[PDB]
Amino acid sequence: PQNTFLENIVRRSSESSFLLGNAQIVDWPVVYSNDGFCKLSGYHRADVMQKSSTCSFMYGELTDKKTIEKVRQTFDNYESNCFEVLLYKKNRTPVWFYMQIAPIRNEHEKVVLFLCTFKDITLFKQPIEDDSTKGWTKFARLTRALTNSRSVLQQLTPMNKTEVVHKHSRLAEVLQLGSDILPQYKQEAPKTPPHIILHYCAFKTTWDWVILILTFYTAIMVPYNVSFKTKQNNIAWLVLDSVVDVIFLVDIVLNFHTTFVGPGGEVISDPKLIRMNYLKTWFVIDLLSCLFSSLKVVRLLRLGRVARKLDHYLEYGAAVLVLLVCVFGLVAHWLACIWYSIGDYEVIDEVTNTIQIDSWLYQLALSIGTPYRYNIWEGGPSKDSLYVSSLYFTMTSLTTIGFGNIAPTTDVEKMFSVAMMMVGSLLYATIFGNVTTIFQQMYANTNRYHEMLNNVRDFLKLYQVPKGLSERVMDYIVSTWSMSKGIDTEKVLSICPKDMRADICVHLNRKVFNEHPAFRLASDGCLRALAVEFQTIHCAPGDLIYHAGESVDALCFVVSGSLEVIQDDEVVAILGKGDVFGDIFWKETTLAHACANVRALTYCDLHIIKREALLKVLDFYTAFANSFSRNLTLTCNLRKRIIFRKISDVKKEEEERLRQ
Amino acid sequence: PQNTFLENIVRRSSESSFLLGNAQIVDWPVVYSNDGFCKLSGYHRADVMQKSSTCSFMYGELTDKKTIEKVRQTFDNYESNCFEVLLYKKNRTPVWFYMQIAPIRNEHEKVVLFLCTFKDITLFKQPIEDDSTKGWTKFARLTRALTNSRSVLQQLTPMNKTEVVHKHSRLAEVLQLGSDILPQYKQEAPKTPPHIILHYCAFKTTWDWVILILTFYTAIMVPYNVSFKTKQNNIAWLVLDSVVDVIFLVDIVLNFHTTFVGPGGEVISDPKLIRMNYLKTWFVIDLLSCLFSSLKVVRLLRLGRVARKLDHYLEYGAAVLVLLVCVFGLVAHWLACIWYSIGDYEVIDEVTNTIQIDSWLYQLALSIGTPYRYNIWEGGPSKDSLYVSSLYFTMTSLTTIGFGNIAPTTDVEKMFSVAMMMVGSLLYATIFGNVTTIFQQMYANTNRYHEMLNNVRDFLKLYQVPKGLSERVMDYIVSTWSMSKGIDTEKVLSICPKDMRADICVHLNRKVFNEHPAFRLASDGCLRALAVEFQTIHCAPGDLIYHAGESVDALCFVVSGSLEVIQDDEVVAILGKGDVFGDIFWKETTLAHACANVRALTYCDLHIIKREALLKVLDFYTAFANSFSRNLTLTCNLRKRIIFRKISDVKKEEEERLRQ
Ligand SMILES: [K+]
Ligand SMILES: [K+]
Ligand SMILES: [K+]
Ligand SMILES: [K+]
Ligand SMILES: [K+]
């Protein structure tokens, strides 16, 4: 979903000098300048920007005031016209210009920009200049000013009294561009020329699936008709072939309207190139396949379409397995057809008029019960029995089972079965390799988890870590792999450079920004920085976050669970569900000693930010630092001690005081 | 094993304002405050904490002194009562409050906290105020003070003379909460509602195994009865089916009392949701299976339970192999049943009254010796021979052996055996893939070791490292892989963020803390820092730790073996089993030159700490730095030289002195 607007303007331009300027802002500042206006006026594309689009920076002394009034009025209310003005270049050279103001609409019909096309008509008019010494100086400059608009555009009548003709041509140009000057500045979808269908359309995929099914049907049925002679010839079967043939012809015609995917880029929608691409790639095979025994067997070339279209599916693992099973079936069928052809050729020698005992057809006739008769020769098995027998034999010989009811006994059958085995071994090996790769795909991840589990267990066993601490480590490993399922956040967030990382981190830390009053006067950039700098931790019951002597260097926000801050074996604070603790880092500049132990009661969830990152962020943004200081109050400051004296000690010391 | 105490209090609360305060500490400081007390008094949950739970910070001028005496007495000795007091909000607004003090017991019946529930009865009493100008000001505030306790709690009789009714309701509320106010603050185990059994209980796993065995039995026996017609019908077999059916009905009833595991969380024990979950997931299959040929064959739907329950076992590698072997056996049995059904249907055409020679049953009858008789038709093989023959054939066709005694010869048998082969190829490929994955699991680790071994050997051979140094490198590689078995401590310790790392490191370095007088006045935090900062090394006989010019930058503790410090080819120190050497880093601030070579005599073990980490730790903790300086004496200081003059030189120079 691009926003191709400059590309359309320059494609339509044919070497123009458009001067896109903003509309909603006062004075209509210039936003963009083509590198054709840098030569028509001498102003580079670094000072023309942010200047008024009324060309107030090129208005001089003898400029027409009334044209200034007209252009001011045209800019005032949104309308398009055409004017001829007399401006000055960077060298204070008087030059006549043609201006073609036109507004450009937004997505929902709003004026956003004002496109100002400029043309040069210096040689086409009389630019009277005062600082001249000879008459010829009034002529040569005309050739100097106009070079790409005289010998290129209007050179058929470059002689006098043609100025009115030039004005008429300019008027015709400006009148017949009603919709060409408004390309609808908007983020639109890709567009295609008429009578062109997208290769990824909803209709095209269904057409491709239909073509695949029909190609499979042809591959199944053509060898059967070639080998078993069919010879039924109904009217309910000769029309299906014709329907399939006309469908394939329709597909050949329709493939000329397909958007070829570019070499690493995106779709290409130029009919002058798609035709040539198809002709050079795959117009010979398609024509040959869709054109006697040879004419009817050449139709197996339709598998080229299946080979071409199966590229995205071949990436997967199960799709290759299904494809291999299908080709296994088709190969078995084709070998069955060849085997029956051999068996039919071998029986009944024609030089003599006897029947061969060697052929598998005669042995099959003995084993079924229907023998041959007559001596022309008639009898034998039915037409279904022959095909079922052939398929059964070629399936015994491809799966490496080989029962032995139907087996080669003639010289030709043996040297054909040798090739059958040579092909079948490779096919079977391919299937086995695909299956084992498919299994390894998932057992790789499972073994990756179990290897870490076993390594941790063996490390704990080796260094004789006492029971009660090994159990906690094992439970933590199991629990974290159950919760996260092996998905590491850092590896995923390393990808997607820092435009989606900030948004993802803001979403992850939404519970400490939405439900906390401190992060309420923060700009988007500051929130992005804080979100990418927090990181979060998960606790377990009994785990300690800070001990009695650790250095507090992180502000911790509690979003789930409950914490217990205990000092001198006495509970002094209970936290949970929206409490912040730690130390006041931004105004102390000294790491302190955690005065109390912070234990976890239930399964907690903390969003802790390190000291250095927080200080860096608060130093970069000044106003937010003041807001953060004013609006944040820690519910448990782990720097100062709470002074108290226990009741049991009071009662114990009272007795001693009474004694003395 | 959570400590859900606040959750129980807030669940029982029904929008109360409990004010949990400590008990063992004098004045009973407030520990936790609900975010319902921040509006009943205006005190935020940042200044109410660490204040006396006697509400001394809200006691005003006209507060009842006698109620103060009662609450002081109630806090003095551990007892629970209820009082009505007249307190002040943050805006000095007189407000009547109901206080419901109650102690909370520890695990072993000890008073720990004092829960003080508060209620507002402002509109329910007459709060006389002095700073008033009109009578109506005495009424509107009543609507302002009470909003969530008048229109929500008591709105059925909001008229005069109902104050006594309100007092009676309050007394009834306080009297009938004897056990609800004491949730036994304690780290307890998960609890379940009555008549609910844990899904991981010791009984549930046995029940699941029994159900698995019975499902396997049904899958084995139902097709046999369907296909071979059985027709024995004893009284010792019709009751086993009934017993299994009632057992499965009992299981269907009992599965309504199972704790479903939450989506990523832990068990869910709400009967109103487990029932709906079971009904939506798996109540149709279970009902259909446990309900003619169809009614007796639908029982194979019981395999859904096996499919569901086998999720944790499917992770392993050998369990999948056992499952695949079992399904191989069951598939062979089912194909045997189908094969016998086909063979029985084919023999003896019923249109005529003859016997078919094609069927495998007739060929089997010929090969055994028992033929068919009569022409109704009687004879043939026994009932055991038919089943053994069918199983043998379908096992020859699944293992890709295919002897050929029993093989398809009829049209139906061939087109059934084709499907048999199509299934068997995939099954056999699956088994092979599983086996090779299982082998690769362990050969991956073995090859990982051998690849490093070969790389080291080839690197030593390539750069022609002289013999006597390559041998030492190879011996070190072999010895360290024998001792550690490929278990890297750093990779294991990277996991388990810094709460178990400190404990593990303290345990690993226990031999330098317990058996050394220097680490005897160290707090837990300092020991944790030192333990996580040491790292340890293993030596070999002949290896040198420090040379004659290296920079000493580590304090080394010897815990096993013996060291030899030699200077000028003379032994000047022997160390071992509790000796510390190195340099005095904390008061020199200059890296020195090791004055002597420290060789290893036996297989040593050192716990060496780098200079930077030790200095950082000793700079963070001040008192421990003084204790460490006072209590540590190095047995071999590798900064100062020992001045000595050898005896052999004395004797040699004596002769020269006598000569001159
Ligand atoms: K075989
Ligand atoms: K294999
Ligand atoms: K094989
Ligand atoms: K065989
Ligand atoms: K045989």
Coordinates of N, CA and C in Angstrom, one line a residue, chain A residues 325 328-329 364 367-369 384-385 388-389 391-392 395-396 399-403 405-406 428 432 435-436 439-440 443 446-447 449-452 455-456 458-460 462-466 469 472-473 476-477 481 483 541 543-545 547 549-551 562 564 570-574 578-579 591-593 599 601-603 633 635 642 644-648, chain B residues 1-4 6 20 22-28 30-32 45-46 49-50 113 185 187 264 266 314-316 320 324 358 393 396-397 400-404 406-409 411 414-415 417-418 421-422 425-426 428-430 432-434 436-437 440-441 448 483-484 486-487 489 492-493 495-500 503-504 507-508 510 524 528 620-621:
Chain A
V325 N 4.0 -38.9 -2.1 CA 3.0 -40.0 -2.1 C 2.2 -40.0 -3.5
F328 N 4.5 -41.3 -6.1 CA 4.6 -42.7 -5.9 C 3.4 -43.4 -6.6
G329 N 2.2 -42.9 -6.4 CA 1.0 -43.5 -7.0 C 1.1 -43.5 -8.5
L364 N -1.3 -65.8 -14.8 CA -2.5 -65.2 -14.2 C -3.8 -65.9 -14.7
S367 N -4.1 -69.0 -12.7 CA -4.4 -68.8 -11.3 C -5.8 -68.3 -11.1
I368 N -6.4 -67.5 -12.0 CA -7.7 -67.0 -11.8 C -8.7 -68.1 -12.1
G369 N -8.6 -68.8 -13.2 CA -9.5 -69.9 -13.6 C -10.1 -69.7 -15.0
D384 N -10.9 -55.6 -16.1 CA -10.6 -55.0 -14.8 C -9.5 -55.9 -14.1
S385 N -9.6 -57.2 -14.3 CA -8.6 -58.1 -13.6 C -7.2 -57.8 -14.1
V388 N -6.0 -54.5 -12.4 CA -5.8 -54.7 -10.9 C -4.6 -55.5 -10.7
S389 N -4.4 -56.6 -11.5 CA -3.2 -57.4 -11.4 C -1.9 -56.6 -11.7
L391 N -1.4 -53.4 -11.4 CA -1.1 -52.4 -10.4 C -0.6 -53.1 -9.1
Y392 N -1.2 -54.3 -8.8 CA -0.8 -55.0 -7.6 C 0.7 -55.4 -7.8
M395 N 3.0 -52.5 -7.4 CA 3.1 -52.0 -6.0 C 3.8 -53.0 -5.1
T396 N 3.8 -54.3 -5.4 CA 4.7 -55.2 -4.7 C 6.2 -54.9 -5.1
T399 N 7.3 -51.2 -3.3 CA 7.3 -51.1 -1.8 C 8.3 -52.1 -1.3
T400 N 9.0 -52.9 -2.1 CA 10.0 -53.9 -1.7 C 9.4 -54.9 -0.8
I401 N 8.2 -55.4 -1.2 CA 7.5 -56.5 -0.6 C 7.8 -57.8 -1.4
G402 N 7.3 -57.8 -2.6 CA 7.6 -58.9 -3.5 C 7.1 -60.2 -3.1
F403 N 5.7 -60.4 -3.1 CA 5.1 -61.7 -2.7 C 5.6 -62.8 -3.6
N405 N 3.4 -64.0 -6.5 CA 2.4 -64.6 -7.4 C 2.7 -64.2 -8.8
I406 N 2.9 -62.9 -9.0 CA 3.2 -62.3 -10.3 C 4.6 -61.9 -10.4
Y428 N 11.9 -45.1 -2.8 CA 11.7 -45.5 -1.5 C 12.7 -44.8 -0.5
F432 N 11.7 -42.3 2.6 CA 12.2 -42.4 4.0 C 12.9 -41.2 4.5
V435 N 10.5 -38.5 5.5 CA 9.7 -38.8 6.7 C 10.7 -38.5 7.9
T436 N 11.9 -39.0 7.9 CA 12.8 -38.8 9.0 C 13.1 -37.3 9.2
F439 N 10.2 -35.8 11.1 CA 10.2 -36.1 12.5 C 11.3 -35.2 13.2
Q440 N 12.5 -35.1 12.6 CA 13.6 -34.4 13.2 C 13.2 -32.9 13.4
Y443 N 11.4 -33.0 16.8 CA 12.2 -33.5 17.9 C 13.5 -32.7 18.2
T446 N 12.2 -30.4 20.9 CA 12.0 -31.1 22.2 C 13.3 -31.5 22.8
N447 N 14.3 -32.0 22.0 CA 15.6 -32.4 22.5 C 16.4 -31.1 22.9
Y449 N 15.1 -28.6 24.5 CA 14.6 -28.4 25.9 C 15.2 -29.5 26.9
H450 N 15.1 -30.8 26.4 CA 15.5 -31.8 27.3 C 17.0 -31.8 27.6
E451 N 17.8 -31.4 26.6 CA 19.3 -31.3 26.8 C 19.6 -30.3 27.9
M452 N 19.0 -29.1 27.9 CA 19.2 -28.2 29.0 C 18.7 -28.7 30.4
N455 N 21.3 -31.2 31.5 CA 22.6 -30.5 31.9 C 22.4 -29.9 33.3
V456 N 21.3 -29.3 33.5 CA 21.1 -28.7 34.9 C 21.0 -29.8 35.9
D458 N 22.4 -32.8 35.9 CA 23.7 -33.4 36.1 C 24.7 -32.4 36.8
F459 N 24.6 -31.1 36.5 CA 25.4 -30.1 37.2 C 25.0 -30.1 38.7
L460 N 23.7 -30.2 39.0 CA 23.3 -30.2 40.4 C 23.8 -31.4 41.1
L462 N 26.4 -33.3 40.3 CA 27.9 -33.4 40.4 C 28.5 -32.7 41.6
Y463 N 28.1 -31.4 41.8 CA 28.6 -30.6 42.8 C 27.9 -30.8 44.1
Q464 N 27.1 -31.9 44.3 CA 26.3 -32.3 45.5 C 25.7 -31.0 46.1
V465 N 24.9 -30.3 45.3 CA 24.1 -29.2 45.9 C 23.0 -29.8 46.8
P466 N 22.9 -29.3 48.0 CA 22.0 -30.0 49.0 C 20.5 -29.9 48.5
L469 N 17.6 -26.9 47.8 CA 18.1 -25.9 46.8 C 18.1 -26.4 45.4
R472 N 14.5 -26.2 44.2 CA 14.0 -24.9 43.8 C 14.5 -24.6 42.4
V473 N 15.8 -25.0 42.1 CA 16.3 -24.7 40.7 C 15.5 -25.5 39.7
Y476 N 12.1 -24.0 39.2 CA 12.2 -22.8 38.4 C 12.4 -23.1 37.0
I477 N 13.2 -24.0 36.6 CA 13.5 -24.4 35.2 C 12.2 -24.9 34.6
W481 N 9.9 -22.8 31.7 CA 9.7 -23.4 30.4 C 8.2 -23.7 30.1
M483 N 5.8 -21.7 31.3 CA 5.1 -20.4 31.1 C 5.5 -19.8 29.7
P541 N 7.1 -17.8 45.0 CA 6.9 -17.7 46.4 C 8.2 -18.1 47.2
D543 N 11.1 -16.4 47.1 CA 12.2 -15.8 46.5 C 12.4 -14.4 47.1
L544 N 13.7 -14.0 47.3 CA 14.1 -12.7 47.8 C 14.6 -11.9 46.7
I545 N 14.1 -10.6 46.5 CA 14.5 -9.7 45.5 C 15.7 -8.9 46.0
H547 N 18.3 -8.4 49.5 CA 18.7 -8.9 50.8 C 18.9 -7.7 51.8
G549 N 21.8 -6.4 52.6 CA 23.0 -5.6 52.3 C 23.2 -5.4 50.8
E550 N 22.3 -5.8 50.0 CA 22.5 -5.5 48.6 C 22.3 -4.1 48.2
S551 N 22.9 -3.7 47.1 CA 22.8 -2.3 46.6 C 21.5 -2.1 45.8
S562 N 2.0 -10.2 45.6 CA 2.2 -9.5 46.8 C 3.6 -9.7 47.3
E564 N 6.5 -8.8 50.6 CA 6.5 -8.6 52.0 C 7.9 -8.0 52.4
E570 N 10.7 -8.8 61.3 CA 9.4 -8.2 61.6 C 8.9 -7.6 60.4
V571 N 7.6 -7.9 60.1 CA 7.0 -7.4 58.9 C 6.7 -5.9 59.0
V572 N 7.3 -5.1 58.1 CA 7.1 -3.6 58.2 C 6.4 -3.1 56.9
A573 N 6.3 -3.9 55.9 CA 5.4 -3.4 54.8 C 4.9 -4.6 54.0
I574 N 3.7 -4.5 53.4 CA 3.1 -5.4 52.5 C 2.7 -4.7 51.3
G578 N 0.2 -2.5 42.2 CA 0.3 -1.1 42.0 C 1.1 -0.4 43.0
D579 N 2.2 -1.0 43.5 CA 3.1 -0.4 44.4 C 4.5 -0.3 43.8
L591 N 24.7 4.8 45.8 CA 24.1 3.5 46.0 C 24.0 3.3 47.5
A592 N 22.8 2.8 48.0 CA 22.6 2.6 49.4 C 22.5 1.1 49.7
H593 N 22.4 0.8 51.0 CA 22.3 -0.6 51.4 C 20.8 -0.9 51.7
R599 N 10.6 -10.3 50.4 CA 10.2 -11.6 50.0 C 8.9 -11.6 49.2
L601 N 5.3 -13.3 48.4 CA 4.3 -14.2 49.0 C 3.7 -15.1 48.0
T602 N 3.1 -14.6 47.0 CA 2.5 -15.3 45.9 C 3.4 -15.1 44.6
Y603 N 2.9 -15.7 43.5 CA 3.6 -15.6 42.2 C 3.5 -14.2 41.8
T633 N 5.8 8.8 44.6 CA 6.0 8.5 46.0 C 6.2 7.0 46.2
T635 N 6.3 3.6 48.1 CA 5.5 3.0 49.2 C 6.5 2.3 50.2
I642 N 13.7 1.8 59.7 CA 12.5 2.1 60.5 C 12.9 1.8 62.0
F644 N 12.2 1.0 65.7 CA 11.1 0.5 66.5 C 11.7 -0.5 67.6
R645 N 10.9 -0.7 68.6 CA 11.4 -1.5 69.7 C 10.2 -2.5 70.1
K646 N 10.5 -3.8 70.1 CA 9.4 -4.8 70.1 C 8.8 -4.9 71.5
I647 N 7.5 -5.4 71.5 CA 6.8 -5.4 72.7 C 7.3 -6.6 73.6
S648 N 7.7 -7.7 73.0 CA 8.3 -8.8 73.8 C 9.5 -8.3 74.6
Chain B
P1 N 3.0 -23.6 46.5 CA 2.7 -23.3 47.9 C 2.7 -21.8 48.1
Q2 N 1.6 -21.1 47.7 CA 1.5 -19.7 47.8 C 1.2 -19.3 49.3
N3 N 1.1 -18.0 49.5 CA 0.7 -17.4 50.8 C -0.5 -16.4 50.6
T4 N -1.5 -16.9 49.9 CA -2.7 -16.1 49.6 C -3.4 -15.7 50.8
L6 N -3.9 -11.7 51.4 CA -4.6 -10.5 51.0 C -5.7 -10.9 50.0
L20 N -4.7 -3.6 58.0 CA -3.8 -4.6 58.6 C -2.6 -3.9 59.3
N22 N 0.7 -4.3 62.3 CA 1.6 -5.2 63.0 C 1.2 -5.3 64.5
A23 N 1.5 -6.4 65.1 CA 1.2 -6.6 66.5 C 2.4 -6.7 67.4
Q24 N 3.4 -7.4 67.0 CA 4.6 -7.6 67.9 C 5.4 -6.4 68.2
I25 N 5.2 -5.3 67.4 CA 5.9 -4.1 67.5 C 5.1 -3.1 68.4
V26 N 5.8 -2.3 69.2 CA 5.1 -1.3 70.0 C 4.3 -0.3 69.2
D27 N 3.2 0.1 69.7 CA 2.3 1.1 69.1 C 1.5 0.5 67.9
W28 N 1.9 -0.8 67.5 CA 1.2 -1.5 66.4 C 1.2 -0.7 65.1
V30 N 0.9 0.6 61.3 CA 0.1 0.1 60.2 C 1.1 -0.4 59.1
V31 N 0.8 -1.6 58.6 CA 1.6 -2.2 57.6 C 1.0 -2.1 56.2
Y32 N -0.3 -2.4 56.1 CA -1.0 -2.3 54.8 C -2.3 -1.6 54.9
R45 N -2.2 6.0 50.7 CA -1.5 4.9 51.2 C 0.0 5.2 51.1
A46 N 0.4 6.3 51.6 CA 1.8 6.7 51.7 C 2.2 7.3 53.0
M49 N 0.8 4.5 56.5 CA 1.7 3.4 56.9 C 2.7 3.9 58.0
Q50 N 3.2 3.0 58.8 CA 4.1 3.3 59.9 C 3.5 4.2 61.0
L113 N -0.7 -10.1 63.1 CA -1.3 -8.8 62.6 C -2.6 -8.6 63.3
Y185 N -3.1 -16.5 58.4 CA -1.9 -16.0 57.7 C -0.8 -17.1 57.8
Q187 N 1.8 -19.9 54.9 CA 2.1 -20.4 53.6 C 1.6 -21.8 53.4
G264 N -1.8 -21.7 30.5 CA -0.5 -21.1 30.9 C -0.3 -20.9 32.4
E266 N -2.1 -22.0 36.4 CA -2.2 -23.3 37.2 C -3.6 -23.8 37.3
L314 N 4.4 -38.1 25.3 CA 4.7 -37.9 23.9 C 6.0 -37.1 23.7
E315 N 6.3 -36.3 24.7 CA 7.5 -35.4 24.6 C 8.8 -36.3 24.5
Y316 N 8.9 -37.4 25.3 CA 10.1 -38.2 25.3 C 10.3 -38.8 24.0
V320 N 7.5 -42.4 22.5 CA 6.9 -42.4 21.2 C 7.2 -43.7 20.5
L324 N 4.5 -46.2 19.0 CA 4.5 -46.6 17.6 C 4.5 -48.1 17.5
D358 N -9.9 -69.4 -5.9 CA -9.1 -68.2 -5.8 C -8.8 -67.8 -4.4
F393 N -0.2 -63.2 7.8 CA -0.2 -62.5 6.5 C -0.1 -61.0 6.6
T396 N 3.4 -60.1 7.5 CA 4.3 -60.1 6.3 C 4.1 -59.0 5.4
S397 N 2.9 -58.4 5.3 CA 2.7 -57.3 4.4 C 3.0 -56.0 5.0
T400 N 7.2 -55.5 5.2 CA 7.8 -55.6 3.9 C 8.7 -56.8 3.8
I401 N 8.2 -58.0 4.3 CA 8.9 -59.2 4.1 C 8.3 -59.9 2.9
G402 N 7.0 -60.3 3.0 CA 6.3 -60.9 1.9 C 6.8 -62.2 1.5
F403 N 6.6 -63.2 2.3 CA 7.1 -64.6 1.9 C 6.3 -65.1 0.7
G404 N 5.0 -65.2 0.8 CA 4.2 -65.6 -0.4 C 3.4 -66.8 -0.2
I406 N 0.7 -67.0 1.7 CA -0.6 -66.4 1.7 C -0.6 -65.1 1.0
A407 N -1.2 -65.0 -0.2 CA -1.0 -63.8 -1.0 C -2.3 -63.6 -1.8
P408 N -2.6 -62.4 -2.2 CA -3.9 -62.1 -2.9 C -3.9 -62.8 -4.3
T409 N -5.1 -63.4 -4.6 CA -5.3 -64.0 -5.9 C -6.7 -63.6 -6.5
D411 N -9.8 -60.6 -7.2 CA -9.8 -59.2 -7.6 C -10.0 -58.3 -6.4
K414 N -6.7 -58.2 -4.2 CA -5.5 -57.4 -4.7 C -5.8 -55.9 -4.5
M415 N -7.0 -55.4 -4.7 CA -7.2 -54.0 -4.5 C -7.3 -53.6 -3.0
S417 N -5.1 -55.3 -0.8 CA -3.7 -55.3 -0.5 C -3.0 -54.1 -1.0
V418 N -3.4 -53.5 -2.1 CA -2.8 -52.2 -2.5 C -2.9 -51.1 -1.4
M421 N -0.5 -51.9 1.4 CA 0.9 -51.5 1.2 C 1.0 -50.0 1.3
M422 N 0.0 -49.3 0.8 CA 0.1 -47.8 0.9 C 0.2 -47.4 2.4
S425 N 3.8 -48.7 4.1 CA 5.0 -48.0 3.7 C 5.1 -46.8 4.6
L426 N 4.1 -46.0 4.8 CA 4.1 -44.8 5.7 C 4.4 -45.2 7.1
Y428 N 6.0 -47.9 8.3 CA 7.4 -48.3 8.4 C 8.4 -47.2 8.3
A429 N 8.1 -46.2 7.5 CA 8.9 -45.0 7.4 C 8.9 -44.2 8.7
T430 N 7.7 -44.1 9.3 CA 7.6 -43.4 10.6 C 8.4 -44.1 11.7
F432 N 11.1 -46.0 11.2 CA 12.5 -45.8 11.0 C 13.0 -44.4 11.3
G433 N 12.1 -43.4 11.0 CA 12.5 -42.0 11.4 C 12.6 -41.8 12.9
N434 N 11.7 -42.4 13.6 CA 11.7 -42.3 15.1 C 13.0 -42.9 15.6
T436 N 15.9 -43.5 14.1 CA 17.1 -42.7 13.8 C 17.2 -41.4 14.6
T437 N 16.1 -40.8 14.9 CA 16.1 -39.6 15.7 C 16.6 -40.0 17.1
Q440 N 20.3 -40.3 17.0 CA 21.0 -39.0 16.9 C 21.0 -38.2 18.2
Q441 N 19.9 -38.4 19.0 CA 19.9 -37.6 20.3 C 21.2 -37.8 21.1
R448 N 29.8 -34.1 19.5 CA 30.2 -32.8 19.9 C 31.5 -32.8 20.6
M483 N 36.6 -35.2 33.9 CA 36.2 -34.7 35.2 C 34.8 -34.0 35.1
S484 N 34.6 -33.2 34.1 CA 33.5 -32.3 34.0 C 32.3 -33.0 33.1
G486 N 31.6 -32.5 30.1 CA 31.1 -31.6 29.2 C 30.1 -30.6 29.8
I487 N 30.0 -30.5 31.2 CA 29.1 -29.7 31.9 C 29.8 -28.4 32.2
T489 N 29.9 -24.8 33.7 CA 29.3 -24.1 34.9 C 28.7 -22.8 34.4
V492 N 25.2 -23.1 32.8 CA 24.2 -23.5 33.7 C 23.8 -22.3 34.7
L493 N 24.9 -21.5 35.1 CA 24.7 -20.4 36.0 C 24.1 -19.2 35.3
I495 N 21.4 -19.1 33.5 CA 20.0 -19.3 33.8 C 19.9 -19.1 35.3
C496 N 18.6 -19.0 35.8 CA 18.4 -18.8 37.2 C 18.9 -17.4 37.7
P497 N 18.2 -16.3 37.3 CA 18.7 -15.0 37.7 C 19.1 -14.8 39.2
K498 N 19.7 -13.7 39.5 CA 20.5 -13.6 40.7 C 19.7 -13.6 42.0
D499 N 19.1 -14.7 42.2 CA 18.6 -15.1 43.5 C 19.1 -16.5 43.9
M500 N 19.2 -17.4 42.9 CA 19.8 -18.7 43.2 C 21.3 -18.8 42.8
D503 N 23.3 -18.2 46.0 CA 23.3 -19.4 46.9 C 24.1 -20.5 46.3
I504 N 24.0 -20.8 45.0 CA 24.8 -21.8 44.4 C 26.3 -21.5 44.5
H507 N 27.5 -22.1 48.0 CA 27.7 -23.5 48.2 C 29.0 -24.0 47.5
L508 N 29.3 -23.6 46.3 CA 30.5 -24.0 45.6 C 31.7 -23.6 46.3
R510 N 32.1 -23.1 49.5 CA 32.0 -23.3 50.9 C 33.3 -23.6 51.6
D524 N 25.6 -11.7 55.0 CA 25.2 -12.6 54.0 C 25.4 -11.9 52.6
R528 N 27.7 -13.4 49.5 CA 27.1 -13.6 48.2 C 27.9 -12.9 47.1
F620 N 32.9 -1.4 48.7 CA 31.5 -1.2 49.0 C 31.2 -1.4 50.5
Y621 N 31.8 -2.5 51.1 CA 31.6 -2.8 52.5 C 32.8 -2.3 53.2

